[model samples]
Target chain A: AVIGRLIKEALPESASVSKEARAAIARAASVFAIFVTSSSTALAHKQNHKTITAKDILQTLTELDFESFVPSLTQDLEVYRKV
Target chain B: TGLITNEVLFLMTKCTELFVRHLAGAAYTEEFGQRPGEALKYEHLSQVVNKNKNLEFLLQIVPQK
Candidate 1:
């Protein structure tokens, strides 16, 4: 799965991940990215804006019941902003 | 349409990749979880995505039998 391979390449400084990890994670990530983008795009629409921000992505997670990921995502997004 | 830039899109994929990684580990921590001969299969992921409308974008990518 090339999609799986690219998704695996995006990981942090981890030593190893299972082959199945790539198999499953790719679908989850692709679906997640689209949903996040769509939801944020809708948000941007209502706000009459075309750009989706980090804030929009974080907010979009809660709507999808992905609240648990928000805190960590926020911290990660902040660090991502710096580095 | 340039709705999102390459840099922000990278963040989206990176963020998504991390979340999926966490869930895989989290599912395992509760005691290695799954069915279908006990291996973590792509079909297993497809089943979960099928349950949610938003997650169904890749339903065709990994369909259920």
Candidate 2:
């Protein structure tokens, strides 16, 4: 999984972490979700929409300076959701 | 099929993946030299998370000790 890659990248050569530490970093993905969801949530809040849409999350990413990455995300979106 | 589809999972998962890579590089390069050991710790990883505003969400899971 990509999560395991985090451990490899961190120490690459020296300074390895235990599975004990790896555990939390694995949880890192969950925290990452919270990070993105909240901002997207806020965008909807401001727009007076109770529901969070892909637009809110995508727009939020743009505001977060991740705009360049948006196109790939959009391209992927079309096929996956069958839209 | 699971409620979450491929594209949604990829965006979230892939974004998290990139975040992790730079995070590792940052952790290893920042105060990484400070510890000077053959092992990595949360505090080591915590260094960048503690300081980075973007990673603030990780503070709870990884905090300074």
Candidate 3:
């Protein structure tokens, strides 16, 4: 269901994606989402909070520097643009 | 480490070529045509990466299942 929603939201209209690619992204997104949720749960437990908000997610992402987890293709495109 | 077959290596090469093409701002008219930014979306890049059957081999390393 998350994969279906993500695919619908992220793709261009009338575009078709392969089953394998869809599966891959779903798996990748699941990994990150699970990591973030687990981290947020731990953080909340440590600080005596019951709810995890966007701030917790942001803090976890910032602390982990999650950007490095994936290749920055946009940055690569910028480099290519300068070439 | 065991060496991969030529077929898998060639598939990697094909994926790499698509990455380079996308980096150069190639447009996909059918999907997000003439978009201002580069084609870096997962839907687009995954299409390129999944073009070859070698993905199954790569997945064995990480175990996507």
Candidate 4:
């Protein structure tokens, strides 16, 4: 799985992000995760008849500058396992 | 010169909109929000353009260009 993803999240200063803002950030992050995951999954299925390995997907996704979305967690987001 | 359905056009529009929004610094959130200082990611635009294979076959020769 995505190891230490939460801990690695680059959330702004807690003092700056209010409880409500943090909650919204959490929700938005979740939505973003889902979007990437689902889109990657769909692209994999489209390319091959089955799921692609994470490494293969990550190689392409990362090259597309999507790493900016989760810079801190990129090291842990083992793109090698797609399914 | 053949007919393409509106559904396909709509899909192109959707992809274009997403690309445009991200290009305009509307992607991500909080400290992670980054706006790539580029007009548009042409590779992504090329993918969309190729989605309509017929589009590149011939020029419509419109008045604009």
lDDT of 2 by residue, B23-56 (tens): 6656666765545456666676778778867667
DockQ of each: 0.31, 0.35, 0.03, 0.03
Report the C-alpha lDDT of model 1 over A1-83, residue by residue, as the tens digit.
65544433433333234576566675566666777888888876776666887777777777776777788777777787788
lDDT of 3 by residue, A1-83 (tens): 44554454444455454555455555544444555566656765575666654344445544544333224433443453466
Show the colliding residue pairs in model 4.
A53-A82, A54-A79, A54-A80, A54-A81, A54-A82, A55-A79, A55-A80, A55-A81
Looking at chain B only, the TM-scores across the models are 0.49, 0.66, 0.36, 0.34
For candidate 3, what's the RMSD? 16.7
Q: Rank the candidates by DockQ, best first.
A: 2, 1, 3, 4
Question: Evaluated with TM-score, which candidate comes out highest?
Answer: 2
State how far residue B53 of model 2 sits from its true place (Å).
1.9
lDDT by candidate, in order shown: 0.61, 0.66, 0.42, 0.33
Candidate 4 regions with alpha-carbon error over 4 angstroms? A1-14, A69-83, B1-65
Which candidate do you rate higher for DockQ, 1 or 2? Answer: 2
TM-score of each: 0.62, 0.64, 0.38, 0.37
Candidate number with the higher DockQ (1 or 4): 1
In lDDT terms, which candidate is top? 2
10 residues in a row with least lDDT, candidate 1 chain A: A7-16
**Residue B30 alpha-carbon offset, candidate 2, angstroms:** 1.3
